[PDB]
Amino acid sequence: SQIRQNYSTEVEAAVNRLVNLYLRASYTYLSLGFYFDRDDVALEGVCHFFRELAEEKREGAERLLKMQNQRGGRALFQDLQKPSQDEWGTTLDAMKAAIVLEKSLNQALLDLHALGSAQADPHLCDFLESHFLDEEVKLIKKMGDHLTNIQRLVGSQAGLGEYLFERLTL
């Protein structure tokens, strides 16, 4: 590649794997959101929450793919593993699942940072720090807030608390 400069094949491969990870999370959020749209689940607010996460993680991957081209790497696409569940239980269960998912993207984001730093790629480090590293911390905090408030409500009246959280928070 004529434009390629200071872009290592170790990093380019990582970005490709991270594109795959973001798309699979976006796929998971798609499943999550449409499950709460079920007539036997019927939690409007929870569905819109996970559908916007699906979009956000999709724009995240499109951002990586664009950066891949700006640096002179070749995007390579793999199969998208299906979501780990077909039914996600309650809001508390869904939220729990989401937080583990975000914590594993964040893990992947940090490893890719440590990689690009050992490779002395300051532009990659700057790209992850602005568009990704901080959004991921804000989101996990916001998700943790939700977990604490759901666990409070589910406490005695499980069915009532799920309704109140969806109406009054989401």
Binding footprint of Fe ion on the chain (CB under 5 A): 7-8, 11, 119, 121
Decide: 19 and 26 in contact? Cβ < 8 Å.
no
Q: Does 52 bind its own copies (CB under 8 A)?
A: no
Q: Does 141 bind its own copies (CB under 8 A)?
A: yes
Which CB contacts under 8 angstroms, 24+ apart, belong to 115-120? 115/10, 115/11, 115/14, 116/11, 116/14, 119/8, 119/10, 119/11, 120/6
Three-state secondary-structure class, residue 86: coil
Q: Does 148 bind its own copies (CB under 8 A)?
A: yes
Among 8, 34, 48, 63, binds its own copies (CB under 8 A): 34
Among 53, 81, 93, 94, binds its own copies (CB under 8 A): 81
Residue with tokens 């664009």: 66
- 4: exposed, middle or buried (C-beta count within 10 Å: 0-12, 13-18, 19+)? exposed
Q: Which of residues 83-122 bind its own copies (CB under 8 A)?
A: 83, 86, 99, 103, 106-107, 110, 113-114, 117, 120, 122
Among 71, 94, 97, 101, binds its own copies (CB under 8 A): 71
Q: Does 13 bind its own copies (CB under 8 A)?
A: no
- Residues at the binding site are 52, 55-56, 59, 62
